[PDB]
Each structure stands twice: as structure tokens, then as C-alpha cells.
């Protein structure tokens, strides 16, 4: 409070108490148009007393396990958090510092495409050399680039280069080195090259590990002479290296032609499917949460009873996902808690087929501007240039030696439309490659039942059908491919969150990971422990499918993935606040009238109801209950293959490593709910007041083709009833008018941000014309040939055959396309020959129904949750579903509305007691 | 302090030792209450936090 | 305290009428906020005495 500081308002009183009172009224009055409040400084002074100890105190304490007890399924660690008096510990700052060794398995490509000769054409060959015995029957094809301007008819100019052949001198990188190739003479140039003796001659992805520090892929180089039909004339030399055993094709696969074409055709080489095997969002599935058989244990010393009890019907991971997404936007990337949300490519899921950016005719010209590619026109290779006679208007003088090139026509070029070429490459690799297995076929060397359908090389060696999706697939419609509307979009190499999460571990599969995992159990997520000695043990998963997330969802255990935890230490930060006040703080927190209370953010009992493949309906009957504070219902359906056994130490039937929609918020099956009904008693419908347009059921969607009375809103098949339910729940205003609500777009799990209605038209088949020339059923035979796909004849001569795998070389001839019936234009099909396909996708939403009498949010403890007709009187509801029938077993992830709270009471030193209470479902059993 | 040294053939420190009273007195007033006060007369390490 | 390291060529002489050694016309990390060498800092120690 020095007067020198006070004069400049650095440690002075403050603006409100030193300015003239009239001035404060003036600046406030004229504060909306003439702001003067920034011209009078004010400084906020720190407490500077009774807030921090001078005692030598550790600011950040590392806790290392007393006991470990490693096992094959989990990795337990037992800590002992000693909090002295005057110390106050927040478990919000507690986390597990985990460092170990991570093997992400060979099924891990951190990059699309290949790294070896990426610019090489797929069906290229690296200077072939195929022989039976050295010097015996030999076949060889390659470019001979290097020149040495030899004087021929003798060995001296050639043998000099041959003596250099044995080294790296052939040097495949260097070529002719002459820019005008026209200037070189055929008899005074010399020929050099370097050929490879190997099996599987493919330039694309060809890798031969070096043996010396200067290129030198091989140590033995037998030289061969090049001579014309006569042996007298010396023409060139050849270097040959044996790559039969030294050659490999990492991150690439051979796509052979069909079995009838296996001979006299080597097919093409394609890079393996990119796969990212990084950790999951927020380190989900890394601690044994939600498991009552292998839970953690936090308890004090005086009170030996464990205060961390976990139920198999709660969801710790998903609750954190919802809590964090409401706390902040999910597009923020926080690498500490590995906070990278699972996000697909919006251009890939809802495939807005807008054709392609049709531009001017674009060509690829010669390296020079002179040539005769497809040399139509007169030869002009033997012409003679004569000087003109301006008086006689004719030739007068012949030029002595006119060395002229002088070809005919424009620059020889090959035409490409990149905007269409890249469009099909985008469609057929970011969309086609992720089709379901039922729309794929083997590659003429692969056989089913040899490996499980959840392995990496199974997914690589099954090319999708080329007509189920292509450039013509609903050419003008923003339409998510209905063939993959039920395919997990987060299992995609464009999943930027997982893409970031995998690259935080490195580009190799041998990762010495060091990570920090937050505590997520709601009772101890933000617990503020007072003085005392606490022991807090927790067990960590070792399942590669659980702890690691693939971008393909393959079985990581079957792909050799594994993890070893070396050190798992517990970090805690302690405020160095004055012991005279922290004991006061801990004493006003030991007082029972003011003790910590924590709720699970999800607030939902979690029940998974099996729905088999062919089934389309599900009945959820429940025993008699009081529903004393129920919040409502939330439900989506999750594939059983993507959902682990609940409360399982180690799930053996779980052979999937993509995005577990149960654990995280990666919901993608909010569609495929036709309708649902609620009956609290055997026959008492919950709405039961003619609230809805269909009072006895929650008709989520109805087909617009069969629609007669309407009941479809937002230009899709969702119903008026269901649309009102969602907007009323999330946004609290439907009776004042439907509107968009930008205040909740950040939430990443609300309705409007991801409710995507789409519409296409499609030709009406089963008509005299309109033959539906696209086959969706593969022949599921060993050969990589699908003749049923050869009826589309689009891009006929410019793409690979439709029966062939897509990534094979093009062949055919230009031919009028026949398949895509023009739905628009002046040559369009008849208006009676078209249909409508109103549809909607809604990802990451998890449909909610509030247990509120007007469906509008009016408090966490809803309108009817305290209505003493349910609270006082027992009821046993039955919930009836009908769903779009899928082809694989799925659950129906039904989330009720529960008030799962904890009252943490710490009456004495190191006496810790937690009381758990859940209002509708207090017993927490299997329902 | 200005030093003059014979030039050696490798990097060497000059181990300088001042004269300090780096003393500690231990206060143990009650059971399991251990407190120490460190004080070093020329070169103290009190940061007044 | 607040600290980063800036290249000498990318910083003019402080309070200089005309810096003749300044032969750089890119982003002056000293003038604007174009700091890019906040890394290359290994540690730091502060001793009031």
C-alpha cells in the first residue's frame, strides 16, 4: 500500500471508490456509446496473507504402488495416499501416470497408400529379369536409361563401364540425363541398365532392404553384355541382382486377376488398408470401470470398508463422454487426457454425390513440346527447308543442313479429367472399401473360413462390389449410402480423432507409450479428500481390443497386438495453502451439514437387450417398481459384436477393436427405430392423454411411401410426434414455435447438430423397363470374378472390368453407359417411373424421452418423477420396440433415468464413508 | 574473486567452498510431530512464500 | 517472468534509430507475436540471492 503504488492505482483503493461520484454516474450513463471505463486503471490485489505456507511443502506428489499383483487379464496397482493435516487433496487432480511397452501389431498402417514407389503405376514392374538358370533361358523387361557415348565396334568403351557395373554405378535413380532426346545418335550413345531377378515383379510398393550404406540393395551384380543380332557389335551392358529372397512387399498387397486370368496376367499391387491402432478417446476402456467383479478399491484406515462400489448397470465411460461434451466442445483436441473425439468424415457418411467439377479439357503433354504420339499426319521426318523468294513467291535456295525435328499436329497429349478421376478415387476408397462383408468378394487367391472375418488380411483380401457404390450411385442426391447406413462410420481412416490418437504414439507399432489417464468414477472423480491415510487400488485392462481402438475394428488379439505396463504411478497436486486455513477448510468439510455430494452425469441405468439378426421387434418387460424420481428414457441399438460383456474381467467373444458405441458416445444406429410404446402397468400407456398423434405409441418414424395422413416432419420419415419429443426435451420450447438452437451445437450429442434428413428419388424398378442392372449379391466363390457386376457398362473402356477387383488395371473399349437411368434432364424417365426415399440419419444422439408431463425440461427431478401416483404406487412397465431388421445380432442400449448420487461423509480424520443412492432402481440388479 | 591458474589440458571446475553455519535445530513438541528449521548464515535459502 | 528465444537476425536493435545489421524482412518475432522457438528450452533456475 505504498503511496507511490497508490498514486498510480497499482496498489490503490480502486476505481469505484476514488473517482468522483458524478463521474462514475457519467461513465456508466454514457457507457453504451462513449466508453470511458478503460481510462481509469484498477488493479486486483492478491491476498498476500494466510493463503500459502512458507513451510517446505511438495507442490506435486508422485504415489507409486505398494502392491502390483500383475495377471494375464488385468494389471492391478495398489497405492497409499498419505494426506497429512493441513493438506487437502482433490481427486480431480489425481490420475495414473502409466508408461509401458505397446505393440500395435502388424495390422497397423499409419498412412493411406504406400511408402515405396508411390508414384509408380500399380501394375508396373521394376526392370524384370526372369531366368531358369544363370545364363540359361531368360526373360527380362525394363528401361535402359544410362548412356556412356561409346565408340562401338570394340569392347574398350563398353568394358570400361562393365568394370564399373559391379558397384552401385548403374544407379537406377539416374536416367539418360539428356533433356532433348532427339539429339542423341543411335550408334554413339551406349546402353546401361540394372535389372532385378525376383519373384512377384511389381514396382508398386517394392522394398528391398539395403545391405550397404550407399544404396546397394544387393552385393552380387553379374554383368551381361548387350549386342545386336551379330556378336561383333557392342551395344550395351546389364547389371542383374538376385532379389528372390531379399525382396519384400510391406504395406502393399497383390490383387491378382480371376483364376481364369491368373496366367498371362500379374494383376496389380494395392497398398494395404490404412489402420490406426491408437488409444481410445479419453483413455476409454483402460481402467476396469463398470465391473463389479474386478472393480477398484478406495478406503481409509480407520474406516476399513470400501467406499468405491461399482455396479454393472452404470456406465462410467459414457457418463464422462456426456459430461465432457456438455462441459466443452468436442472439436477441441486435448492430448493430455487423450481428448480426441471420434469423428467421421461428414462428406463420407452422408454421400452428397454432386458429380464432379467439370472443367476444361485437360491433358498431359510430352516432357518436351515436340513429338508424334500416335503420329497421324504426314511424317515430315525427311523434309528439306528451302529459303523463300519474295519476288518469285517460291522456293529459291535450299538450306545446306537443316537438322529439323518438325512433327505434325498439336502437342501429343493424353486427356484426363482430374475432378472426375479424384472423385471416383474418393468414392471408391473412402466409401467403397468400408462396405459390409456381405457386399464383397474374395480376390481369387483368398478363401473364406481360413481366417476369421475380424482379421486384418481378411478385410484387405476382400474387394467390394464395384456397382453397389460408384460415381453414378444416386448421382445428384445428398444421400448416405443405404448399404452402409448401419456401418460404424467411426471405424474409418478419416476418423480424425483416432487419427490424432494413433499418431500420438508414433508411426511404428513398437511404442514406448507414456500416458496419463484420469479417474472417471463419479464418486471419486472430483472427491476432495481431507487429511488422513487412504489406500486406493485400481486394476488396468490388458485386452488389446478394449484398451486400443482400430480404425478397422479387426481382432487385435488375433493380429498380435499386446501391451505391457512397466510403471503405473499416481500423480497428485496439492495446494500449498496455509495450514492455518486448510485445517479450517478440512474442518468445515468434515462437518456433516456440508459434505461432498457427487452424481453420475449420465444419470441412467444401462440395460442391453439382445435383438437377433432377423428379428424386428423387442419387448422390454420390467418388474413392479416405484419410479421415485425417474428422469426418462434414452435408447439406441448397439451391435452385439461391438459391445463387450458387461462387468466382465475379460470378454473372449469380443473380437472387435473399433469404436465401442456403448463405452463412448459413438452412436450411429439412432435410426432403425420404427416406433416404441410405454405401458407403466400391464395396460396403462404412459402418454395416455392423447398427447401424441398416435396416443398409444411413440412412432419414431413411418415410411413416406405408405404415408397418407402426413405424420412426417423435417422433410424425412421422422414423425411429427417424435420430432416434438426431441425438440421439447433438448431445447425446452416447442409450444412457442419450432426453431434452431445454436446454444447447444457444441454439445456433440444433442439433436439438431446431427439430425440429418436426406432424400433421393431412384428409378421405379419392377416396371416394363428399368431393369435394375446393379447386382448387390456377390457370388461368394473362390475366384475373384463377379460376372453379375458386368451389366452397368459405365466408364466402359476407362476402368477395370466390373467383374474384376476395382484396383486392377483398366481395360475395355469406350461404350455408351446404360445403367444410370436419368432422373433429371430432358431425357429423364417418366414421372410415374420414379419414387421417393425420405430417410434420416442421426449419429451420436441416443434418443431421449423425458419423464416430464409436457416433455419439456423443467428440472432434473422431472414433473412426474415426484408425482405421488408413481412414487407412492408400484408399477411394472412394459416397453415394446419394433426396429428395422439388421443382418447381425445387436443390443438395444436402453438408458433409464436415475438419480445415482453419493454423499461422501468424512466425520473424523481418515474416516471415509460414502453412501450411494439411486432413485428409481435402488437395488442395482440385472434388469 | 579473481583466480590465476596453471593452464590444464581439460575442462576443470574450481571447487569453491565458503564458510557457512548450515545448522538445523529439530523441534519435536508432541508425539509424531517432527519439525526442522534450516538456516545457513552467509547463504540462506528462505524465499518467503 | 516471460521468456522465449529469438534469432538475432530476426530482431532489430532495441531502441535503434536505424539497425544496419538488420538484413531480414520476415516476421519479427520480437515485434509481433510470431514466437516459434518456445521449445529448445531445456530448463531454468532462478536464485534471488
TrEMBL record, chain C:
<comment type="function">
    <text>Major capsid protein that self-associates to form 240 hexon trimers, each in the shape of a hexagon, building most of the pseudo T=25 capsid. Assembled into trimeric units with the help of the chaperone shutoff protein. Transported by pre-protein VI to the nucleus where it associates with other structural proteins to form an empty capsid. Might be involved, through its interaction with host dyneins, in the intracellular microtubule-dependent transport of incoming viral capsid to the nucleus.</text>
</comment>
<comment type="subunit">
    <text>Homotrimer.</text>
</comment>
<protein>
    <recommendedName>
        <fullName>Hexon protein</fullName>
    </recommendedName>
</protein>
<comment type="similarity">
    <text>Belongs to the adenoviridae hexon protein family.</text>
</comment>
Amino acid at each position: 500500500a505504498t503511496p507511490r503504488l497508490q498514486y498510480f492505482h497499482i496498489a490503490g483503493p480502486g476505481t469505484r471508490e476514488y473517482l468522483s461520484e458524478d463521474l462514475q454516474q457519467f461513465i456508466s450513463a454514457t457507457g453504451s456509446y462513449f466508453d470511458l471505463k478503460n481510462k481509469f486503471r484498477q488493479t486486483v490485489v492478491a491476498p498476500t496473507r494466510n493463503v500459502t505456507t512458507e513451510k517446505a511443502q511438495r507442490l506435486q506428489i508422485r504415489f507409486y504402488p505398494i502392491q502390483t499383483d500383475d495377471t494375464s487379464t488385468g494389471y492391478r496397482v495398489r497405492y497409499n495416499i498419505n494426506v497429512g493435516d493441513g493438506w487437502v487433496l482433490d481427486m480431480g487432480s489425481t490420475y495414473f501416470d502409466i508408461k509401458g511397452i505397446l505393440d500395435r501389431g502388424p495390422s497397423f498402417k499409419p498412412y493411406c497408400g504406400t511408402a515405396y514407389n508411390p508414384l509408380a503405376p500399380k501394375e508396373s514392374m521394376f526392370n524384370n529379369w526372369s531366368e531358369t538358370a544363370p545364363g540359361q533361358n531368360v526373360s527380362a523387361s525394363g528401361q535402359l536409361s544410362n548412356v556412356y557415348t561409346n565408340t562401338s565396334t570394340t569392347k574398350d568403351t563398353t568394358a570400361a563401364q562393365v568394370t564399373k557395373i559391379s558397384g552401385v554405378f548403374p544407379n537406377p535413380n539416374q536416367g539418360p540425363g539428356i533433356n532433348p532426346l532427339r539429339q542423341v545418335e543411335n550408334a554413339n550413345t551406349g546402353v546401361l541398365g540394372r535389372f532385378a531377378k525376383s519373384q512377384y515383379n511389381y514396382a508398386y510398393g517394392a522394398y528391398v532392404k539395403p545391405v550397404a550404406a550407399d544404396g546397394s540393395q544387393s552385393l552380387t551384380q553379374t554383368p551381361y553384355w548387350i549386342m545386336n543380332n551379330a556378336g561383333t557389335e557392342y551395344l550395351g551392358a546389364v547389371a542383374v541382382e538376385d532379389y528372390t529372397n531379399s525382396l519384400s512387399y510391406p504395406d502393399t498387397m497383390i490383387v491378382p486377376p480371376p483364376e481364369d486370368y491368373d496366367d498371362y496376367n500379374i494383376g496389380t499391387t494395392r497398398a494395404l488398408r490404412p489402420n490406426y491402432i491408437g488409444f481410445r478417446d479419453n483413455f476409454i476402456n483402460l481402467l476396469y470401470h463398470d465391473s463389479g467383479v474386478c472393480s477398484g478399491t478406495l478406503n481409509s484406515e480407520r474406516s476399513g470398508m470400501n467406499v468405491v462400489v461399482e455396479l454393472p448397470d452404470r456406465n462410467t465411460e459414457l457418463s464422462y463422454q456426456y459430461m465432457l461434451a456438455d462441459m466443452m466442445s468436442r472439436h477441441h483436441y486435448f492430448a493430455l487426457w487423450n481428448q480426441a473425439v471420434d469423428q467421421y468424415d461428414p462428406e463420407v457418411r452422408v454421400f452428397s454425390n454432386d458429380g464432379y467439377e467439370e472443367g476444361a479439357p485437360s491433358y498431359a503433354f510430352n516432357p518436351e513440346a515436340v513429338g508424334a504420339g500416335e503420329g497421324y499426319g504426314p511424317d515430315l521426318s525427311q523434309i528439306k527447308l528451302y529459303t523463300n523468294n519474295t519476288a518469285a513467291n517460291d522456293k529459291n535456295t535450299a538450306v545446306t543442313n537443316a537438322t529439323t525435328n518438325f512433327y505434325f499436329g498439336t502437342v501429343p497429349s493424353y486427356e484426363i479429367d482430374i475432378s472426375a478421376t479424384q472423385r471416383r478415387n474418393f468414392i471408391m476408397a473412402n466409401i467403397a472399401e468400408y462396405l459390409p462383408d456381405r457386399y464383397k468378394f474374395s480376390i481369387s487367391g483368398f478363401d473364406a473360413t481360413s481366417v476369421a472375418p475380424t482379421t486384418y488380411e481378411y478385410m484387405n483380401k476382400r474387394v467390394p462390389l464395384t456397382n453397389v457404390v460408384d460415381m453414378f450411385t444416386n448421382v445428384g442426391a445428398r444421400w448416405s449410402i443405404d448399404q452402409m447406413d448401419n456401418v460404424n462410420p467411426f471405424n474409418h481412416h478419416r476418423n480424425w480423432g483416432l487419427k490424432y490418437r494413433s499418431q500420438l504414439l508414433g508411426n511404428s507399432r513398437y511404442v514406448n507409450f507414456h500416458i496419463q489417464v484420469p479417474q472417471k468414477f463419479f464418486a471419486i472423480k472430483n472427491l476432495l479428500l481431507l487429511s488422513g491415510s487412504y489406500t486406493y487400488e485400481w486394476v488396468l485392462r490388458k485386452d488389446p481390443n478394449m484398451i486400443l481402438q482400430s480404425s478397422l475394428g479387426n481382432d487385435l488379439r488375433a493380429d498380435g497386438a499386446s501391451i505391457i505396463y512397466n510403471e503405473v504411478n499416481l500423480m497428485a497436486n496439492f495446494m500449498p495453502m496455509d495450514h492455518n486455513t486448510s485445517n479450517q477448510l478440512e474442518l468445515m468439510l468434515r462437518n456433516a451439514t456440508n459434505d461432498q455430494t457427487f452424481v453420475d452425469y449420465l444419470g441412467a441405468k444401462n440395460a442391453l437387450y439382445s435383438v437377433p439378426a432377423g428379428s424386428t421387434a423387442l419387448t422390454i418387460n420390467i418388474p413392479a417398481r416405484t419410479w421415485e424420481g425417474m428422469r426418462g428414457w434414452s435408447f439406441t441399438r448397439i451391435k452385439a459384436a461391438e459391445t463387450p460383456q458387461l462387468g466382465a474381467q475379460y470378454d473372449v467373444n469380443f473380437k472387435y477393436s473399433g469404436s465401442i458405441a456403448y463405452s463412448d458416445g459413438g452412436f450411429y444406429l439412432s435410426h432403425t427405430f420404427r416406433n416404441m410404446s410405454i405401458l407403466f402397468d400391464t395396460s396403462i400407456n404412459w402418454p395416455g392423454n392423447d398427447r401424441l398423434l398416435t396416443p398409444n405409441m411413440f412412432e419414431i418414424k413411418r415410411s413416406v411411401a405408405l404415408d397418407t395422413e402426413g405424420f412426417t416432419m423435417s422433410q424425412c420419415d421422422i414423425t411429427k410426434d417424435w420430432y416434438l419429443i426431441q425438440m421439447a426435451t433438448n431445447y425446452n420450447f416447442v409450444y412457442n414455435g419450432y426453431r434452431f438452437w445454436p446454444d447447444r451445437q457444441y454439445f456433440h450429442y444433442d439433436f439438431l447438430r446431427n439430425f440429418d434428413p436426406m432424400t433421393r428419388q431412384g428409378p421405379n424398378f419392377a416396371l416394363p423397363g428399368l431393369f435394375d442392372l446393379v447386382s448387390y449379391t456377390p457370388t461368394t466363390d473362390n475366384s475373384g470374378e463377379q460376372p453379375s457386376q458386368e451389366a452397368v457398362r459405365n466408364n466402359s473402356g476407362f476402368i477395370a472390368p466390373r467383374s474384376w477387383p476395382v484396383w486392377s488395371a483398366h481395360q475395355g473399349e469406350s461404350w455408351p453407359a446404360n445403367w444410370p437411368y436419368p432422373l433429371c434432364g430432358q431425357q429423364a424417365i417418366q414421372p410415374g417411373q420414379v419414387l421417393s426415399y425420405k430417410k434420416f440419419l442421426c449419429d451420436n444422439y441416443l434418443w431421449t424421452i423425458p419423464f416430464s408431463s409436457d416433455f419439456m425440461y423443467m428440472g432434473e427431478l422431472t414433473d412426474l418423477g415426484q408425482n405421488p401416483m408413481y412414487t407412492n404406487n408400484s408399477h411394472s412397465m412394459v416397453i415394446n420396440f419394433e426396429l428395422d431388421p439388421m443382418d447381425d445380432p445387436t443390443y438395444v442400449y436402453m438408458l433409464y433415468g436415475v438419480f445415482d448420487t453419493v454423499r461422501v461423509n468424512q466425520p473424523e480424520r481418515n474416516v471415509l464413508a460414502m453412501a450411494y443412492f439411486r432413485t428409481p432402481f435402488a437395488t442395482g440388479n440385472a434388469v
